[PDB]
């Protein structure tokens, strides 16, 4: 089991860390969602599906910088909604193919009423998301840590 980003940055068997740089809608009004769709950015696969079934959760999601201070967050994992920053590990999604499959995570970030002006700064860390991978075969329990960075400033109009 291993994963990669849309630009080919890999985290190999056994886990590890990678940075993911995302373009963000540059203007987001109070009452709208800023959507960070990681399912187009992070992909994973099973290396031995003949024998092993892989299980994958979002173990934790943490907010940083302007997302921590200026937004109210929800994460969707395989379509189901949970608070972000997270309060529990999600259910498991099965990976049973060598073909790359999206990691089905998206963040929905809506401005808090006090937000105004530059609410996220270009180049800043906005989230750390931990993918936890286990299987039905041995004791492997690995973390794939995704550090999510903003490519651009985001303004909440005033
Ligand atoms: C041939 C053989 O013994 C093995 C091949 N890969 C192994 N193991 C690797 O791939 C598995 C399937 O994605 C994962 O469950 C393991 O955690 C590990 O990533 S053991």
From Swiss-Prot:
It is found in: Fimbrium. It comes from the Bacteria. One of its GO terms (molecular function) is D-mannose binding. GO terms for biological process: cell adhesion; cell adhesion involved in single-species biofilm formation; cell-substrate adhesion; mechanosensory behavior. The keyword Signal applies. Involved in regulation of length and mediation of adhesion of type 1 fimbriae (but not necessary for the production of fimbriae). Adhesin responsible for the binding to D-mannose. It is laterally positioned at intervals in the structure of the type 1 fimbriae. In order to integrate FimH in the fimbriae FimF and FimG are needed. This is Type 1 fimbrin D-mannose specific adhesin. It comes from Escherichia coli (strain K12). The chain holds residues 22 to 179 of 300 of the full protein.
């Amino acid at each position: 089991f291993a994963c990669k980003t849309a630009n080919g940055t890999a985290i190999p068997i056994g886990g590890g860390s990678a940075n993911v740089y995302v373009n963000l809608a540059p203007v987001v009004n109070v009452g709208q969602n800023l959507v960070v769709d990681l399912s187009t950015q992070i992909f994973c696969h099973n290396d031995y599906p003949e024998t092993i079934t892989d299980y994958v959760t979002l173990q934790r999601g943490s907010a940083y910088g302007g997302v921590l201070s200026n937004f109210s967050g929800t994460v969707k994992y395989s379509g189901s909604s949970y608070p972000f920053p997270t309060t529990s590990e999600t259910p498991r999604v099965v990976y049973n193919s060598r073909t790359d499959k999206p990691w089905p995570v998206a963040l929905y970030l809506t401005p808090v009423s006090s937000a105004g002006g530059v609410a996220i700064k270009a180049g800043s860390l906005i989230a750390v998301l931990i993918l936890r991978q286990t299987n039905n075969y041995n004791s492997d329990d690995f973390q794939f840590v995704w550090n999510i960075y903003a490519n651009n400033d985001v303004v909440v109009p005033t």
